């Protein structure tokens, strides 16, 4: 899975996760819930 997206942290609550060659962006703020790929 690959997409032209580079989910980066936005505020002091988002965290970039690392999984099967995949990445996620989870945060208390729902506006920062992103995921690479
Ligand atoms: Zn955030």
Coordinates of C-alpha atoms and ligand atoms in Angstrom, one line a residue:
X1 CA 0.0 0.0 0.0
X2 CA 1.5 3.4 -1.0
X3 CA 0.0 6.8 -1.6
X4 CA 1.3 10.4 -2.2
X5 CA 0.6 11.2 1.5
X6 CA 3.1 12.1 4.2
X7 CA 1.0 12.2 7.4
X8 CA 3.0 14.4 9.8
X9 CA 2.1 15.4 13.4
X10 CA 0.1 18.6 13.6
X11 CA -0.3 19.6 17.3
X12 CA 1.3 18.3 20.5
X13 CA -1.1 15.4 20.7
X14 CA -0.7 13.5 17.4
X15 CA 1.6 10.5 17.2
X16 CA 3.0 8.8 14.1
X17 CA 2.7 5.0 14.4
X18 CA 4.7 2.4 12.4
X19 CA 3.2 -0.8 11.2
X20 CA 3.5 -3.3 8.2
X21 CA 5.4 -0.8 6.0
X22 CA 2.5 1.5 7.0
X23 CA 2.2 4.6 9.2
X24 CA -0.6 6.1 11.2
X25 CA -1.3 9.5 12.8
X26 CA -3.5 9.2 15.9
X27 CA -4.2 12.3 18.0
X28 CA -6.7 13.5 20.7
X29 CA -7.8 16.0 18.0
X30 CA -9.9 14.2 15.4
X31 CA -8.7 16.6 12.7
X32 CA -5.2 14.9 13.0
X33 CA -6.4 11.3 12.5
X34 CA -4.4 10.5 9.3
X35 CA -2.5 7.4 8.0
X36 CA 0.3 7.2 5.4
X37 CA -0.6 5.0 2.4
Ligands
LIG1 ZN1 -2.8 16.7 17.0

